[PDB]
Amino acid sequence: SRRWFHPNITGVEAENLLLTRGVDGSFLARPSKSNPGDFTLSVRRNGAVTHIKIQNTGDYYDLYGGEKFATLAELVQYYMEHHGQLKEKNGDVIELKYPLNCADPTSERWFHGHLSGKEAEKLLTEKGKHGSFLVRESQSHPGDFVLSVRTKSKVTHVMIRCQELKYDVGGGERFDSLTDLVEHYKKNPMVETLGTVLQLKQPLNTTRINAAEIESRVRELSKGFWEEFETLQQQECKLLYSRKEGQRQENKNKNRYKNILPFDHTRVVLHDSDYINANIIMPEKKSYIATQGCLQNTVNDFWRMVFQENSRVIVMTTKEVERGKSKCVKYWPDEYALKEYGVMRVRNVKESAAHDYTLRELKLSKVGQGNTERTVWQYHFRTWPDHGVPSDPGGVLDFLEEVHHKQESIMDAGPVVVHCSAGIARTGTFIVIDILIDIIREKGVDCDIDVPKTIQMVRSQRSGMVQTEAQYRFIYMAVQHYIETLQRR
DSSP: OOTTBOTTOOHHHHHHHHHHHOOTTEEEEEEOSSSTTOEEEEEEETTEEEEEEEEEOSSSEEETTSOEESOHHHHHHHHSSTTOOOBOTTOOBOOOOEEOOOOOOTTOTTEEESOOHHHHHHHHHHHOOTTEEEEEEOSSSTTOEEEEEEOOOOEEEEEEEEETTEEESSSSOOBSSHHHHHHHHHHSOEEOTTSOEEOOOEEOOOSOEEGGGHHHHHHHHHOOHHHHHHHHHTTGGGGOOOOOGGGSGGGGGGOSSTTOOOOTTTBOOOOOOOOOSEEEEOOOOOOEEEEEOOOTTTHHHHHHHHHHHTOOEEEEOSOSOSSSOOSOOOOSOOTTOEEEETTEEEEEEEEEEOSSEEEEEEEEEETTOGGGOEEEEEEEEOOOOSSSOOSOSHHHHHHHHHHHHHHHHSTTOOOEEEEESSSSSHHHHHHHHHHHHHHHHHHOSSSEEOHHHHHHHHHTTSTTOSOOHHHHHHHHHHHHHHHHHHHOO
């Protein structure tokens, strides 16, 4: 987990922590209380503490005096090692040496706080498998905690004693935080005298729901969304995969933002150089490619990729110059016009304007070979607001239904190409919504969906997909809308 992240702390307290149990080079990150959605990097230097603003533009994380990033975890990783170059406007170096770990277990998946043993047993019974576990506060002995584990099946309760600030299960080693304890016993499982192993394989799932009762869950979260989202973020340390190819000198100018790079193990490798800032996304039979908006020097690469991957549908989530900002170089010809882009040729056959989007029917082929020609349908979503999300998800739902049918009607088509600015925020929101609806569309409303687990899966294929709580909520709203305007049928 992001040990260096402190969820319910204030600027003043954060100083006290670093001034008492931190040294020079000590750091932590916290949500900003002054700014909804923003964050702060409290660093200790020269016996004193600075607070560096980390803003979430809605598309990425912007570090004042630093770079832009897809996740906080990738941010800290970047300054904690290779290219440790964090400076003040004076030009002096701020070093991140020692993560100051948080004892507060609140946004841990396994932590349920105030909860009864009868309630906990219920959950573990019908939401659990071998290895499911959770940690609640003891109703019985206050200050202590109970670990409850599921393993012809049983549930087992182990007391966790809190003595003089440390935690122990009644013997052995005494830990500093409940997170320390849990990690230890995940790795070093408690055993019974009668020979049962108390395995801790995965926290008990509290986010999976049945699509039918989506309305009841949205009710609860709206009463929350914030907790669920934060718990999702606390998992991004499990996703720090290699992005070495994107860091090659030759590939640097091929990225819209230098530190927002494709994971090596899912990047699109261009044959016939080989680099593009794009990742294949496969749900765990429609697949996706998530990519940044084009750069003037990457347009030929965009079409190479489209041709190579056999994509027949493109989804463009950014509108034509939103206001005073380049979010994508125009990479398609004017209507009726025909253009070459390196070895690739594109004719714009026709444009249909809908209310929420524009459709361009494009003909793509390699130069020299007429036989390689295929129609690519570019779906250009136009009404996404400059700030936040659409008030109503209907326009988005309608847009995806059309994309889905187009894709479904074209035999043996490759991945649907989805892109926005950096290719992680709206790109992430559309893809997840589409994956969720796909599941419902195929399996009906008596099916299990887990929004956060779905985002996690996708985030293991491209960095930091889905950026904001608003996007998180909107995904929920979108799915609820689909369910409702479906049951009425």
